Amino acid sequence: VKLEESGGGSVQAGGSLRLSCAASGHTYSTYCMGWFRQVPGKEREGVARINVGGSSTWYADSVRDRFTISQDNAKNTVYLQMNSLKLEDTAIYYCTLHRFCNTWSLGTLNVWGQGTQVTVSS
């Protein structure tokens, strides 16, 4: 399983950015894919996921109304639309995958992407 990340960048507070992640290789029929984020040195945390091949989503409390995750199941790609960005959203965002969403939440057993910088400035 390999994860290809795209998007991210820098935007002024209140702006918008998008992230994309495509899974390739040996994917299961359905699987959990989304992002964690981490400020260097600080603790990683889940951001959003979606069950690719199903529909269920999950959002961190702090992003729940500003971010939306969607899928293009045929492309094995998920997308994160990040609106109303805050300074606190600056981090490296890592695409990450597990066959089962309830385990995805732990991080520990996931496949991990290389990370995309998201920077929100004043």
Partner 1 sequence: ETITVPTPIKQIFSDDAFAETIKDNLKKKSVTDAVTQNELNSIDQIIANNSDIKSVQGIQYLPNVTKLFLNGNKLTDIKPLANLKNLGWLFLDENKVKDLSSLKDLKKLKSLSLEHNGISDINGLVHLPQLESLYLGNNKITDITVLSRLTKLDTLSLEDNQISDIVPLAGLTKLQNLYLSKNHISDLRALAGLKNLDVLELFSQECLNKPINHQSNLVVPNTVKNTDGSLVTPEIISDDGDYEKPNVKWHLPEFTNEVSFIFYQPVTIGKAKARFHGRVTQPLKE
| Residues that bind partner 1 in the complex, under the rule CB under 8 A | 29-30, 51, 53-56, 100-103, 106, 108-109
**Cβ-based nearer residue to partner 1, 12 or 29:** 29
**Cβ-based nearer residue to partner 1, 27 or 83:** 27
Locate 84 and state its tokens. Answer: 């109303």
Q: Min. distance of Cβ 101 from partner 1 in angstroms?
A: 7
Q: For residues 73 and 111, what is the distance between their CA atoms, to the nearest angstrom? A: 18
Q: For residues 40 and 52, what is the distance between their CA atoms, to the nearest angstrom? A: 29
**Cβ-based nearer residue to partner 1, 18 or 75:** 75
Total Cβ atoms within 10 A of residue 49: 25
β-strand pairing of 31-38 with 45-52: antiparallel
Q: Min. distance of Cβ 118 from partner 1 in angstroms?
A: 28
**Cβ-based nearer residue to partner 1, 62 or 103:** 103
Left (φ > 0), alpha (ψ -120 to 50) or beta: where does 88 sit? alpha
Q: Min. distance of Cβ 51 from partner 1 in angstroms?
A: 6
Locate 3 and state its tokens. Answer: 């994860």
Q: Min. distance of Cβ 94 from partner 1 in angstroms?
A: 18
